[PDB]
Design a protein around this nucleic acid. Sequence first.
RNA 1: GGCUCUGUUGGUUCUCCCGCAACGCUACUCUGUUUACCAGGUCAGGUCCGGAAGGAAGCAGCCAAGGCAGAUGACGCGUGUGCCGGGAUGUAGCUGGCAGGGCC
Length: 90
Amino acid sequence: RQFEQQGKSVMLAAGDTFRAAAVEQLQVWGQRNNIPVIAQHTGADSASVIFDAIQAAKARNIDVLIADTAGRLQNKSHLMEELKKIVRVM
RNA sequence: GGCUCUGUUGGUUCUCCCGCAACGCUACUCUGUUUACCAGGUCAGGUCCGGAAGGAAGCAGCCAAGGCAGAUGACGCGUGUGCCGGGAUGUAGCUGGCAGGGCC
Ligand code: ALF
């Protein structure tokens, strides 16, 4: 809504396929803002979803795209490598 | 100014197979101690046979070994990691691009 206020078009992307009902939550937040939200399912690859979200945003000429991520502790290296994979794909 | 679904293509999930790299799981054995005579070995002391030479049954101690524990390698069972790994397969499910219609 903050980015919806000055007239910038906003689209949301769900990057958490791990936690339960995160997709549905961001879909609720997306419905409250009356803006399209791109997500697939729980368990899906996050980097792929975010990638497709950016591609779609480029095709739909979306001004601002916000990409969510899964909650992760810093002491976990594999999740850090996953996030690095997300960035690398982006 | 947005959206949906077809044509084509890129991913992803599930089922099956496999490679590399990156994180995590039992039963046995090594040490800690334990088990009087009635599994075994060495068997002190003592005792049995003998003039002598020497053998003998065998307690304790010790070592296996049998109970109970502290953890060591391979078998057995798993995976929200990376190479968007390589493949098989869906009449599948989800997502994106493009050629676009049409709906507003
Ligand atoms: F949405 Al969360 F940990 F609760 F990423």
